Every structure is written in structure tokens, then in C-alpha cells.
């Protein structure tokens, strides 16, 4: 079976992720990347609801699950599930960046 990293996962820095999203909005507005200084992950998004805004979120590995660090934390079993949650919670506004 195939169990890769989500399609929007890139081994890029916070700055690189930010630049990728600005340069090609047509390809999506959400990137999953390695978390700086940790084995955890980060999600960088570019939303254009009112004005363009770049936002970063922490996704922590906890046991065999991942906890998205939000006001009310959400815990899911894998990274595909985390991407599904970001899309669902933003009602489709977030779309994985497919380079």
C-alpha cells in the first residue's frame, strides 16, 4: 500500500512556504511543512477573505495521533485527516497547494 505524506507537504521553511503561496495562488493556499526545531509539523495558509493574510498553525505529534493547536485543540489519527479537517473547518476555502 502507499502511505505518503499529504500532497501539500513540502520540506520547506516558513519563508519558502509563504513565497510559494504568493507566487502561485492558482495552485492552492495551504502547505504542510516540517515544524521548525521539532519533529512536529506546521501548516502555512494564505487566505483572501478580507485582505490577503499569511497564517501558521502548529500540528503536534502526540502518541500515534496529531493535535492541531487551536483555541479548542483537535486530535486526528494521521496527516491526511489533518488536511481534511482544515478544508472542512474553513468550508472549502483552504485548498492544498499542489505544486
Amino acid at each position: 500500500v502507499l502511505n505518503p505524506m499529504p500532497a501539500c507537504f513540502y520540506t520547506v521553511s516558513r519563508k519558502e512556504a509563504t513565497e510559494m503561496l504568493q507566487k502561485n495562488p492558482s495552485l492552492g493556499n495551504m502547505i504542510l511543512r516540517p515544524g521548525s526545531d521539532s519533529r512536529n509539523y506546521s501548516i502555512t495558509i494564505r487566505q483572501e477573505i478580507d485582505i490577503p493574510r499569511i497564517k501558521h498553525y502548529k500540528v503536534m505529534s502526540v502518541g500515534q495521533n496529531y493535535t492541531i493547536e487551536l483555541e479548542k485543540p483537535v486530535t486526528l489519527p494521521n496527516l491526511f485527516s489533518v488536511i481534511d479537517y482544515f478544508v472542512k473547518e474553513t468550508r472549502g476555502n483552504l485548498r492544498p497547494f499542489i505544486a
Binding site: 498553525y57 487551536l70 483555541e71 482544515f86 474553513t90 476555502n93
Partner: peptide
């Protein structure tokens, strides 16, 4: 580095 803890939807 700072992070958001609120996801925004329309």
C-alpha cells in the same frame, strides 16, 4: 515564531 490558534471560515 508566532502561530495562529483560530481557523477562519466564511
Amino acid at each position: 515564531n508566532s502561530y495562529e490558534n483560530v481557523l477562519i471560515a466564511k
